[PDB]
Amino acid sequence: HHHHHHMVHITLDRNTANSWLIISKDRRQVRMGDTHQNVSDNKERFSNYPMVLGAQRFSSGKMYWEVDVTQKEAWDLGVCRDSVQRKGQFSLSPENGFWTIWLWQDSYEAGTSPQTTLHIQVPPCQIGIFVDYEAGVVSFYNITDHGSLIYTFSECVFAGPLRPFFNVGFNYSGGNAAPLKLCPL
């Protein structure tokens, strides 16, 4: 792909984070804390899952960013509507305003309804995410495997501003403490 030149500088929005997340001072890294992080509750925070949004809102154009997932067992990545539900249980699906992929129990899947099996020969250490707002496209690239395509959502009905979306995942196993990091341009 040749999407690298639409690179955007993404930062994380503390105020949207689940109350167990620790966002670095530069707002470029997030990890699961071992306890509630001593913050007040607010209506923006994801209550049920270890999720956080980027600060940037996109309503036009072409945007690209990269996320480091080294040594994690579980995570979700992509984009979502600014108006997604924050409280209670919900599924990651385009019907609920999410365009995502994930790793879960040694398999990669796209957040369609129902979910779609991905075919990845080289486990990725970094993921590239491309959004073309006007075309209605969200694509995912395997940076570890020379930028190979992982998945394309097409005919997307965004129906609002989009925000970068992140889930660091739970750490029941002790093998999923590693952070998500936004990679430099």
Ligand X SMILES: CN(C)c1noc(C2CCNCC2)n1
Q: Which residues bind ligand X (CB under 6 A)?
A: 18, 20, 48, 170-171
Rounded to a whole number, what is the largest CA-CA distance in the chain?
Answer: 43
> What SS3 state is found at 96?
helix
Which residues are CB-neighbours of 49 under 8 A, at least 6 positions away?
18, 167
Rounded to the nearest whole angstrom, what is the least distance from the CB of residue 181 to ligand X in the complex?
A: 20
Q: Among residues 28 and 31, whose Cβ is nearest to ligand X?
A: 31
Cα pseudo-dihedral 100, 37, 83, 150, rounded to 10: -10
Rounded to the nearest whole angstrom, what is the least distance from the CB of residue 51 to ligand X in the complex?
A: 9
Q: Among residues 22 and 120, whose Cβ is nearest to ligand X?
A: 22
Residue 153: how many other CB atoms lie within 10 Å: 22
Q: Among residues 18 and 142, whose Cβ is nearest to ligand X?
A: 18
- CA-nearest of 103, 77, 72, 105 to 176 is 72
Rounded to the nearest whole angstrom, what is the least distance from the CB of residue 171 to ligand X in the complex?
A: 6
Rounded to the nearest whole angstrom, what is the least distance from the CB of residue 71 to ligand X in the complex?
A: 18
Rounded to the nearest whole angstrom, what is the least distance from the CB of residue 20 to ligand X in the complex?
A: 5
Q: Among residues 139 and 171, whose Cβ is nearest to ligand X?
A: 171
Please tell me the number of Cα atoms within 13 Å of 103 on its side-chain side.
20
Which residues are CB-neighbours of 156 under 8 A, at least 6 positions away?
94, 99, 136, 137, 138
Q: Among residues 81 and 86, whose Cβ is nearest to ligand X?
A: 86
